[PDB]
Design an enzyme around this catalytic site. Structure first.
Site, mmCIF file in Angstrom:
data_model
loop_
_atom_site.group_PDB
_atom_site.id
_atom_site.type_symbol
_atom_site.label_atom_id
_atom_site.label_comp_id
_atom_site.label_asym_id
_atom_site.label_seq_id
_atom_site.Cartn_x
_atom_site.Cartn_y
_atom_site.Cartn_z
ATOM 1 N N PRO A 129 0.912 -1.247 0.149
ATOM 2 C CA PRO A 129 -0.099 0.051 -0.008
ATOM 3 C C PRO A 129 0.617 1.269 0.050
ATOM 4 O O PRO A 129 0.251 2.398 -0.276
ATOM 5 C CB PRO A 129 -0.841 -0.173 1.490
ATOM 6 N N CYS A 130 2.142 1.122 0.487
ATOM 7 C CA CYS A 130 2.896 2.323 0.469
ATOM 8 C C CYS A 130 3.225 3.149 -1.074
ATOM 9 O O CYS A 130 3.464 4.150 -1.031
ATOM 10 C CB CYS A 130 4.206 2.099 1.138
ATOM 11 N N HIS A 131 3.043 2.105 -2.060
ATOM 12 C CA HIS A 131 3.437 2.794 -3.379
ATOM 13 C C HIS A 131 2.430 2.139 -4.571
ATOM 14 O O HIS A 131 2.465 2.705 -5.561
ATOM 15 C CB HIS A 131 4.806 2.561 -3.886
ATOM 16 N N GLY A 132 1.852 0.969 -4.256
ATOM 17 C CA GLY A 132 0.906 0.513 -5.041
ATOM 18 C C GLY A 132 1.590 -0.620 -5.872
ATOM 19 O O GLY A 132 1.216 -0.584 -7.170
ATOM 20 N N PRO B 164 7.756 -0.516 -8.441
ATOM 21 C CA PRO B 164 9.033 -0.174 -8.832
ATOM 22 C C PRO B 164 9.979 -1.300 -8.119
ATOM 23 O O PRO B 164 11.460 -0.996 -8.027
ATOM 24 C CB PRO B 164 9.277 1.166 -7.830
#
Ligand SMILES: CCCCCCCCCCCCCCCCCC(=O)OC[C@H](COP(=O)([O-])OCC(O)COP(=O)([O-])OC[C@@H](COC(=O)CCCCCCCCCCCCCCCCC)OC(=O)CCCCCCCCCCCCCCCCC)OC(=O)CCCCCCCCCCCCCCCCC
Ligand SMILES: CCCCCCCCCCCCCCCCCC(=O)OC[C@H](COP(=O)([O-])OCC[N+](C)(C)C)OC(=O)CCCCCCCCCCCCCCCCC
Ligand SMILES: CCCCCCCCCCCCCCCCCC(=O)OC[C@H](COP(=O)(O)OCCN)OC(=O)CCCCCCCCCCCCCCCCC
Ligand SMILES: CCCCCCCCCCCCCCCCCC(=O)OC[C@H](COP(=O)(O)OCCN)OC(=O)CCCCCCCCCCCCCCCCC
Ligand SMILES: CCCCCCCCCCCCCCCCCC(=O)OC[C@H](COP(=O)(O)OCCN)OC(=O)CCCCCCCCCCCCCCCCC
Ligand SMILES: CCCCCCCCCCCCCCCCCC(=O)OC[C@H](COP(=O)(O)OCCN)OC(=O)CCCCCCCCCCCCCCCCC
Ligand code: HEC
Ligand code: HEC
Ligand code: HEM
Ligand code: HEM
Ligand code: HEM
Ligand code: HEM
Ligand code: FES
Lengths: 74, 380, 147, 241, 144, 380
Positions: free
Chosen positions: C110-113, C126
């Site tokens: 959830p921090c970047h998807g 990423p």
């Protein structure tokens, strides 16, 4: 600097040694050891022992005096 | 052509341990100094294997020591070997000093001075190392020794605050004592090299005190195998002391964590300090007690100027032999008094022992040498 | 004597009983159903474990290897494809992924998807690499011991 | 008071030079500590994995660890939660801080008994003398309420109630739980808790004694060889006069 | 650490006594809630990083003690991050809970834009514009 | 009377080493550098001692202890950044010293050269463990990378790495033993440097011409004493302008975060004195081959005495080998630049060409050039 060959000037001295493989490692061990141990003890015991004897006496006196100090005084 | 006399690394080993001329009649007491070197090496090795798990923070010092003794494989062997090796190191050191006193070995003045500097260094190393496990008696002995070191007027309080890193013994004191206890044995090793160099400049001393140049033997294999036998014997006492009775020379109260709120009913250091502590209890003055401690170590360095005889060793001086054994007896008395409570009759016994100690070393021994010279028809 | 004491000091330098206690003492139980992914605490790191079905085995086997950002097939990950045992650590910033979500039914960061599949291969985000498969040993089939 | 009372020397089965511990007594004393002494005292430096191969097997110590709850965490919402204990966990605290321990025991803090036979003069004998030595106070002394008379405690005013009486617990091996037996077993267990390396140390000492008894005469023989080169040397003098 | 730098001892003591710090335990063995002192560290918003990730939707807000020295660019990175919040370009879709900051690695930061015009009031009457606030906090983080 | 400088058994060593040592008159400023190294060494030790007085080797309290040194200890930031920047300047002096030895043909002193290679290995290990010590992100991950490539060794690598680690990963056992080893290693380096100077003084020092310098020799005092004081003050100038104006131009920003095993950095690299070694490592697509190439890179630096195929010692009169030498120095600069770059285009092919040219210039082209100028000067 102080190696062998120039330590001291010695004249007319003859020295004899054997191989270690011709002589025993313990030649007459106790028959010449117990008299020598007793002789060395005889020469040194009167100068060694009495200080340690009086230390033992002061130690026992201090222990019994501490125990008498802790005791009651009726 | 041979690499023993030509290679510059092997040349020093050849002229210090292989082809060094040594007297043929030196007894087993001359083992002890060599034993000391091995003891130092052993301590360093065990100390290194104690430094791999010791954490020098007050919240994790005693816990790290218990982790060494309980979870690290043979960590109990390493720690108790380190402690009992320190004790056996002081045994060898005391016998080395007493042999130097008995056989007149203080005429080698520079060797004697490097020795007493080594003695001061190893005493400081042992004190800081005992502070390190952070027990009850570790913290309280550190507090006692530093706050009596504060007795110099106008300099003492600033000095003990700068030694402490604060108002008392705390985390900064523990960290700096770990660093100092680590750094001191390497300086001790360098001073031991200088000690051996100053000895090898002039040769060593025989028990008769005569000139040993008439009969000298190579160091190898004679004193090599003699030192190997001495090392084996020292390891026998050391392994008996660590593997059967690990606590005759220790203190149970160091197995409690350090509590600043709780003071113990009896505070004492180890036995190799205890006699000095007895002298520290002998004089009821703070600064006088501190100087009594410092002179009680330093009169050994003073003794090369107290030789009033024309014979070196004590082998042919029986009155000074008796007085020397009275001195060793007094040292045993002071060692016993130092671990006793400050209560009658130990006060007058300790004062009498300190008076006898300083009287024997300062006054009576040169008079005994003078009258021995007079009885041998030498003194006018 | 010298060999003995050298062995004592070498064994002292090795791993202590405290650090050996923190590994190989984990017991995975059999009360965990199909498709339920949870984290255990192994070696100071999260570890996701889930019991799967043959449909997800075929779904993960349908994904090719050469076109991947990190080439690894399903049989090279685990020798039991019906048990999935990975490390629940985001490989980019260190967040905690959330399993059983996305198009392929896997982990979600959830921090970047980031979107992960059921096996753990990188699919979106990423992260330039996959999820590392820990080694394990087999007791009776109710219990598997990681490491 | 100021005057003390030294505990005597009880003939333990581990008193000898090479005599190891009695591990059945250590197991019974662990049961004593878990059932009686764990309510007030702590054992911070002993884990459940230390009992494996000493008193219990792997599964028995696993069951003993699983019988108690450990506050682990934090969870993914940052909360502490209970969990069943495992083998890597230490023995649980009775109180989280010493202040609540002093509050729940009328000022006195019960010490952590991980070195209590290594931190007391006389060792576990003293512990035995603390446990079977409770008696009625003599005439003259009137101690404060909340204290008890034990002649072996320093000052003779202990804050500990007498914790052992006959059948204070039950033993799984059918041993009669008299007060002296329970005190002896917990003294053996507390001796193990300070020296887990005791039996290994005595085995290494036995090997050292045999090994040095082998090598002192042999090294002495090589020394006597190399030095009996010189100890039979004969010297003579030939002055020309 | 603020006395002799930005505040006197009275102002810093009042700042410390403004906020409350947990301290203890007492003689009964409980943790109480005392006023702060000069020796106290700055109060943490969360006791553990897990509740920090829970309160900020997975993302852990880092410790800004060496956040100038931990990033390339120093306080320039902080100034460009706080004054560089712009709308995402076409071709990239941003999910809810993430914000487009081009100076962040990956360009999708999880921090809501914290500063705006007159977000706080200054004691000395400085106009609290967004760039001035960002410059002041970058100078303060460089000092920290 | 007598001369106390030449007859005292302790002052004779200082007189033979630093006072009346015969030295070449024409040695340039590069001959300062090794002496500067010794000074830098003791500077490191001094700063390290004070950094040992407030640092706690524990993963909970390592980074916090470092921040406590930087913020709360009086001038602790100064001593810490002096320690780090003096480590960097120590490697600067190391590379210039080794480059002097390579250029001027000082590697014909074979025992001194191999002893120096041993010193180089020891100081690289010391700096690696010291960089692990503050327990940042880059410290933990660099230790992980170096120990993994050590674990690439077949059939003994895994056992050796789990025995170096003290566990299954990098943890507080690794941190404590790295603190102990980083503490103890500089004293071994100091004793080894004493042996280094001993071998040099029994073989004599070399002039930049490479000729026999016995015709023109001068005492060390007072020429090279004051020349080394000037070099020491210039080294202090560069060290102080590095510590007081740019404290972080050589440091790593990611080391200022606490160590996290869950989070890996996007780029992992060691410090700048390891970067050419890392670039040599990264070029070869075989981890055993990469470690083999690293160790044999430092070992062909050690093997450089056996590649001398010229009748002239120094490179003062050898311009072709001078050109090849500066190609080698520029290639080392290229490898240092590549080592701080990721594995992207075009860094792989550039690094592979750089390592191939490095090994070819050291092994192949330099004796070929020596033979070429030997023929070209009609020497053979
Ligand atoms: C007593 C009964 C036996 C007896 O009379 O033997 C005669 C013999 C003496 O006869 P001698 O021929 O007149 O003396 C010359 C020796 O033969 C020549 O031998 P030595 O006296 O030179 O011995 C060298 C010395 C070497 O001593 C050392 O190396 C010890 C160094 C110090 C170690 C630490 C000691 C202090 C620790 C304090 C804690 O050895 C000892 O001190 C004893 C070594 C015993 C080895 C094991 C034997 C089995 O006595 C011994 O050998 C006594 C020791 C053995 C019993
Ligand atoms: C004044 C009174 C003194 C009384 C004691 C001394 C005189 C009587 C001695 C009687 C003989 C004692 C043993 C002699 C002896 O050394 O025998 C062993 C010797 C030599 O045996 P050995 O020397 O191999 O004995 C072993 C010695 N150790 C243990 C050190 C290796 O003779 C015979 O065995 C034959
Ligand atoms: C203990 C052993 C005592 C002993 O045996 O003493 C007698 C012995 C005689 O030796 P000696 O006088 O040299 O004559 C040999 C034969 N002609 O004499 C000796 O062996 C002399 C021993 C000298 C060393 C004794 C050291 C004792 C410990 C002193 C500790 C304190 C030192 C000072 C510290 C301040
Ligand atoms: C363990 C207990 C039993 C021990 C064994 C007892 C002895 C049994 C065997 C005896 C054999 C005797 C053989 C001959 C021994 C000769 C010893 C010797 O040399 O004695 C001389 C010695 C030193 O005399 P000197 O010091 O000059 O006298 C002036 C006083 N200071 O003079 C003396 O030693 C005597 C004076 C000692 C004074 C001590 C004072 C202490 C305080
Ligand atoms: C570098 C900057 C340029 C230095 C320079 O100008 O060097 C020229 C100088 C020429 O000296 P020379 O030819 O002997 O004398 C001429 C008349 N006196 O040549 C010299 O001074 C050469 C001596 C210094 C050589 C080292 C320079 C590079 C430093 C890094 C070397 C790394 C070696 C490998 C280490 C890891 C393996
Ligand atoms: C002419 C001057 C014009 C300007 C006037 C102003 C004054 C300037 C100075 C004038 C000097 C006058 C002459 C006095 C100096 C001494 C002679 C000299 O230096 O000559 C130039 C030199 C000739 O070579 P020399 O060494 O003398 O002999 C070789 C044998 N034929 O030639 C050289 O050394 C040339 C060297 C060229 C090297 C090229 C290297 C190319 C490849 C590099 C690769 C490196 C990186 C590899 C990386 C791989 C991985 C990516
Ligand atoms: C709660 C009622 C306890 C029980 C159950 C046990 N102990 Fe205890 N103990 C308790 C207190 C409050 C104290 C401190 C009293 C004081 O005045 O300090 C103690 C102390 C001990 C000690 C230390 C004695 C000493 O001289 O330091 C020991 C060795 C001890 N207790 C042993 C012990 C054992 C073996 C127990 C299980 C049978 C046990 N205690 C239980 C309170 C309580
Ligand atoms: C809660 C809404 C926050 C406020 C108030 C502030 N920040 Fe923040 N920030 C927040 C989070 C949840 C994070 C985690 C990283 C992420 O994915 O968003 C951050 C991060 C930072 C950083 C680090 C950036 C990096 O590249 O590591 C910085 C330098 C930062 N934040 C600065 C900052 C400043 C100066 C603030 C006061 C104006 C501030 N933040 C407030 C959430 C929140
Ligand atoms: C550089 C080498 C040394 C290191 C690294 C070292 C390290 C340590 C450490 C970590 C401890 C604490 C662990 C423990 O409880 O024993 C310690 C204790 C101790 N050290 Fe050392 N030491 C060294 C040398 C010495 C020397 C030369 C002596 C003797 C003078 C010495 C005497 C002691 C003593 C007496 C203790 C206390 C023992 C104890 O209380 O358990 N150490 N040392
Ligand atoms: C740090 C502990 C010490 C070590 C490691 C040490 C080491 C040595 C060594 C190796 C020798 C040569 C071998 C020998 O003669 O026994 C020696 C001799 C000597 N030492 Fe020490 N020593 C120490 C402490 C001392 C002290 C404290 C003194 C001073 C009292 C001292 C004074 C002497 C003297 C006078 C000699 C020569 C006597 C002789 O050879 O006959 N030493 N020491
Ligand atoms: C015996 C002497 C030495 C001691 C006691 C010592 C001690 C320490 C300590 C405690 C640290 C951690 C402090 C910190 O960095 O925050 C450290 C770091 C370091 N040491 Fe040493 N050291 C010594 C010698 C050396 C030497 C000779 C070098 C190599 C030239 C060296 C290189 C380093 C490096 C590179 C660091 C990391 C600095 C950083 O945080 O960036 N040390 N040392
Ligand atoms: C670790 C730090 C080092 C120190 C402290 C050190 C110390 C010294 C000193 C004081 C000198 C004499 C002064 C001079 O002529 O430069 C010297 C010379 C020398 N060193 Fe080192 N050195 C070090 C590293 C090395 C290394 C790594 C090598 C091997 C490549 C080396 C090889 C040499 C050689 C060959 C000489 C003689 C050069 C000459 O005098 O002409 N040194 N060193
Ligand atoms: S933070 Fe998890 S994918 Fe980037």
């Amino acid at each position: 600097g102080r190696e062998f060959g120039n330590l001291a000037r010695i004249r007319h001295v003859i020295s004899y040694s054997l191989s270690p493989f011709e002589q025993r490692a313990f030649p007459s061990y106790f028959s010449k050891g117990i008299p020598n141990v007793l002789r060395r003890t005889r020469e040194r015991i009167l100068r060694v022992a009495p200080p340690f004897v009086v230390v033992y006496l002061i130690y026992t006196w201090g222990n019994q005096e501490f125990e008498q100090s802790k005791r009651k005084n009726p | 052509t041979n690499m023993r006399k030509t290679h510059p690394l092997f040349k020093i080993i050849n002229h210090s341990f292989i082809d060094l001329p040594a007297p043929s009649n030196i007894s087993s007491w001359w083992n002890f100094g060599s034993l000391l070197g091995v003891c130092l090496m052993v301590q360093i090795i065990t100390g290194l294997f104690l430094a791999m798990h010791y954490t020098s923070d007050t919240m994790t010092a005693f816990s790290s020591v218990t982790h060494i003794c309980r979870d690290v494989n043979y960590g109990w062997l390493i720690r108790y070997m380190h402690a009992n090796g320190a004790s056996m190191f002081f045994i060898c050191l005391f016998l080395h000093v007493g042999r130097g006193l008995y056989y007149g070995s203080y005429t080698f003045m520079e060797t004697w001075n490097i020795g007493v500097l080594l003695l001061f260094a190893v005493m400081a190393t042992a004190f800081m190392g005992y502070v390190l496990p952070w027990g009850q008696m570790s913290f309280w002995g550190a507090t006692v020794i530093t706050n009596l070191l504060s007795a110099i007027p106008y300099i003492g309080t600033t000095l003990v605050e700068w030694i402490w890193g604060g108002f008392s013994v705390d985390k900064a004191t523990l960290t700096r004592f770990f660093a100092f206890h680590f750094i001191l044995p390497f300086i001790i090793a360098a001073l031991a090299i200088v000690h051996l160099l100053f000895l090898h400049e002039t040769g060593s001393n025989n028990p008769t005190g005569l000139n040993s140049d008439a009969d000298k033997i190579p160091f190898h294999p004679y004193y090599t195998i003699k030192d190997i036998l001495g090392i084996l014997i020292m390891f026998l006492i050391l392994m008996t002391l660590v593997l059967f009775f690990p606590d005759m020379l220790g203190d149970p109260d160091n197995y409690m964590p350090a509590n600043p709120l709780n003071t113990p009913p009896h505070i004492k250091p180890e036995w190799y300090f205890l006699f000095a502590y007895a002298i520290l209890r002998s004089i009821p003055n703070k600064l006088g007690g501190v100087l009594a401690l410092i002179l009680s170590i330093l009169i050994l360095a003073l003794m090369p100027f107290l030789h009033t005889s024309k014979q070196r060793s004590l082998m042919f001086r029986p009155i000074t032999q008796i007085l020397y054994w009275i001195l060793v007896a007094n040292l045993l008395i002071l060692t016993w008094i130092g671990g006793q409570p400050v209560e009658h009759p130990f006060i007058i016994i300790g004062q009498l022992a300190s008076i006898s100690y300083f009287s024997i070393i300062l006054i009576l021994m040169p008079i005994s040498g003078i009258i021995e010279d007079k009885m041998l028809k030498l003194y006018p | 004597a010298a060999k003995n004491v050298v062995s004592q000091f070498v064994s002292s330098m090795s791993a202590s009983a405290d650090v050996l206690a923190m590994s190989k003492i984990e017991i995975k139980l059999s009360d965990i159903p199909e498709g339920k992914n949870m984290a255990f605490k192994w070696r100071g790191k999260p570890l996701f474990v889930r019991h799967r079905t043959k449909k997800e085995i075929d779904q993960e086997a349908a994904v090719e290897v050469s076109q991947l950002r990190d080439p690894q097939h399903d049989l090279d990950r685990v020798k039991k494809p019906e048990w999935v045992i990975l490390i629940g650590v985001c490989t980019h910033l260190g967040c905690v992924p959330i399993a059983n979500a996305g198009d392929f039914g896997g982990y979600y960061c959830p921090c970047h998807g980031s979107h992960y599949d059921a096996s753990g291969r990188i699919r979106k985000g990423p992260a330039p690499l996959n999820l590392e498969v820990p080694a394990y040993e087999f007791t009776s089939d109710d219990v598997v011991v990681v490491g | 008071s100021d005057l003390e009372l030294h505990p005597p020397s009880y003939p333990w089965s581990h008193r000898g030079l090479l005599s190891s511990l009695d591990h059945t007594s250590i197991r019974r004393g662990f049961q004593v500590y878990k059932q009686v002494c764990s309510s007030c005292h702590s054992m911070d430096y002993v884990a459940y994995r230390h009992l494996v191969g000493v008193c219990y097997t792997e599964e028995e110590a696993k069951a003993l660890a699983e019988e108690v709850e450990v506050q682990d965490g934090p969870n993914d919402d940052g909360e502490m939660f209970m969990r069943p204990g495992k083998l890597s966990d230490y023995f649980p605290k009775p109180y989280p801080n010493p202040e609540a321990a002093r509050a729940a025991n009328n000022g006195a803090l019960p010490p952590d008994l991980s070195y209590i036979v290594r931190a007391r003069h006389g060792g576990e004998d003293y512990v035995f003398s603390l446990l079977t030595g409770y008696c009625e106070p003599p005439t003259g002394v009137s101690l404060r309420e909340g204290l008890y008379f034990n002649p072996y405690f320093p000052g003779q005013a202990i804050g500990m109630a007498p914790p052992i009486y006959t059948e204070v617990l039950e033993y799984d091996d059918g041993t009669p739980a008299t007060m002296s037996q329970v005190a002896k077993d917990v003294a053996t267990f507390l001796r193990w808790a300070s020296e887990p390396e005791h039996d290994h140390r005595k085995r290494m000492g036995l090997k050292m004694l045999l090994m040095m008894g082998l090598l002192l005469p042999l090294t002495y023989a090589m020394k006597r060889h190399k030095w009996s080169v010189l100890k039979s040397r004969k010297l003579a003098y030939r002055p020309p006069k």
